[PDB]
Amino acid sequence: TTQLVKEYQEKRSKLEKFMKNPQHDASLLSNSNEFRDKNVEFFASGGTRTSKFDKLENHPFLGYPYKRGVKRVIQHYEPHVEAGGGEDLYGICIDIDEFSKTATIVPITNNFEGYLVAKDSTVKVKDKLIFNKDGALEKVKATINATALTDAKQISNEVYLVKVAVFGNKA
Amino acid sequence: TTQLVKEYQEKRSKLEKFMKNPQHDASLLSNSNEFRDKNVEFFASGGTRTSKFDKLENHPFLGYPYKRGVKRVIQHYEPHVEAGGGEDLYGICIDIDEFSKTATIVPITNNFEGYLVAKDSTVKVKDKLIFNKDGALEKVKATINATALTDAKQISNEVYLVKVAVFGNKA
Amino acid sequence: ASLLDSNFVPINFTEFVQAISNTYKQRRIQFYENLKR
Amino acid sequence: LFDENYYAKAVANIIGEVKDPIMYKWFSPDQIEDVDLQMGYQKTVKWDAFLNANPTTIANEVNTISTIGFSSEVVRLNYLKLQYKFRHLKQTSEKFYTSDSYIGDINNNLLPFAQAYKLASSEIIKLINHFVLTGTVSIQKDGKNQKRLLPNMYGLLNMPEQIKEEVASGDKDKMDKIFEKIEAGLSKLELGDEFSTPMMVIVDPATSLKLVKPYAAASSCEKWEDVLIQTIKAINNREDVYIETSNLLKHKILIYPLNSELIKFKPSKYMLPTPNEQVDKDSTDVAHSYIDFVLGGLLATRKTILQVNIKQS
Amino acid sequence: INNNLLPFAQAYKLASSEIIKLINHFVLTGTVSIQKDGKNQKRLLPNMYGLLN
Amino acid sequence: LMKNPQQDSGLLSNSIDFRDQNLIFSNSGGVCTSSKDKIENYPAKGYPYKRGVKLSFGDGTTELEVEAGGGDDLYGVCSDIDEFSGMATVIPITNNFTGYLTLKKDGQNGVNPGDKLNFNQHGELEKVKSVNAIALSKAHKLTEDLFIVLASVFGNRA
């Protein structure tokens, strides 16, 4: 009974760790009256600077590709976006509707400026970054040109958010 | 992610097994038009026959004492009720409320007729039953006089409900 | 509040959509009234 | 609004020309009930009582009485919203493409807004009917490349926990084997006390042509259709049985009752095509418009649908 | 929902439906029981019979 | 060889089915079109319809045109032609595109969804280096020499 409840808590915490906006009821309110450094959060969807004429495509997704580089995988069902990088990079996931399980992707043809998941806390400003197999950004085979604007910021044991601008592909 | 979801479902099922009326969302309406054998379920609270002059006491509980014999445990907080039998039996828990964590219990001085948890499926009609250390009824040194009215009926892997009339203590 | 009524004049797109839904419901009711198996 | 939104006025004028969906024939008037939302989930609660013991005789004085219990079940229905876009001519540009016999650009396949909306609405209604009958969304005749949908979104053909029978490939032409499988499924049906209700059967045209053959040496004055009607009447307590032909089905027979207490269609009030206010406009004569439609809302009881699939391999 | 409590009207309707089902079963078979096996029947007075018994 | 067939048809069309009614050569544009797409038009040399285009320069008296081609000179993808004005509608290579494009009549059976594609010298897609194109379906044959395929082009690669 009690052990079952503890296991339920652990599983719920582990599952909600990989969630954009997990629903956690709190016993008391939090104080965030200061207006600075409130943007570094896992639920901060979209980008820091967004243009009216940006191209957004919604696709079914497998796994959790939120704030990660995505590739197209074709299976019978329609093709789906999966968290991955390398030479297969098609775009980056900037939003996810979990009810419909639909991920929104900005194509690599468009330029983006915003926070993305990093491999670890070894990223500094003015660094060249590459998307790994898991869709995470790692310090430098850079087929694309992405530069880090800030340092790696830690929210959880594996949640590392870094402000990066991606502006196409190299040659 | 999907593995975490599967583990969460497993732990949720394990927790919901030990619950009066676990809340589940189903895609279909189960059909039970047959009015026979529609009362042998774990959510059937109370007793088969209930008198207006029955004495009911609500107490804080530890563990899950639902449909089990309970005993008073003193620990600072007020004393609670824990599932147990033997010579320490105080009463039998006939109802439960998990929101307030309050168990509705009939004292041993008041006779009862209803479905209670049995240790296993080795109980027949006209059998003398004793409450074990876990508060479950097992076939027979019986301090109380409880006789099985029906045979053990299985609903879950360990859920065994038996119709029993308890009418005091022996000598 | 249906598009079948000529006197009805919607003021906004919300009223127009509600009238469309009401018209669909009325057409379904009429079909079931005039349906014979 | 109509003095400002020409597209809205055109939609209002042209809405009457759109034909009613064929899915209405598959359900009784009482089985369909509209709800009010666009996307999300709804919960339905069904309450049922039960007797806990034998009744007690009221003789002399007694206070110990038997009890009647209660229980409830909750079912969650998921809905979805989808949209389509279509190009057309700008209203001010129609006069420069009007002709004596038609309006529009034949060489570039450009239509007036009313005609384009009517055709798109017809196509969307066909897709809605396909989803309602089959429970899947696809634009390929092969049936592959299906759009992944939400859980708790099922049609008549893919509803879980229902009776399914498979007629073998070698007996695909054996009507006796087909009827044997149908009888087995009818026996496995579980209608409870609501068995005294009309029944509905949906068959593909090939199955219908096989049915209209004389009933099998050979006999006369009786058809396989009549044999099936009698067989279904054997279980529906001599109630009415209706048969329909749908080109959507392929070598499949669907049998289900017409009782709201067993199967109910509660679709959104915005399920049918609805125009969108957003109209893209440029310096050219080409404009774009959007049509929205809602999917979902079929509820059924467990083991009340018979699905006979004749393997054509 | 958790405590399976209902308003008086709905509870009365469901209880009446169940009692009518039991009455119909008694009228048909001639016995009163709530078990599918047909055991644990209520002992009834003599000169009380149904169509089947 | 034309957006609309030059020869007329002796038969009316049957508007009953709704599935697989889009695999026609007259289907212009893209299957999924964004309202924020950049669209250009150019004079047309030859018939670059449903083909990758490259810039062509004349003597100098007349302006530049677009001709069916690829390789290192790929400028975009032609998605429509107005025949009366000789105007080819072009979506630049810097803009994402998804639609039906001409496929090389060689090894078309070997083309499967998820296969990398590149433009050839004649503006035809072929199975593979410098252009990111992925086939989303199999080759559909509209004529003994005409094959189309659903593909997505999302810019150049390194």
UniProtKB/TrEMBL annotation, chain C:
Section covered of the full-length record: 187 to 223 of 230
Protein name: Uncharacterized protein
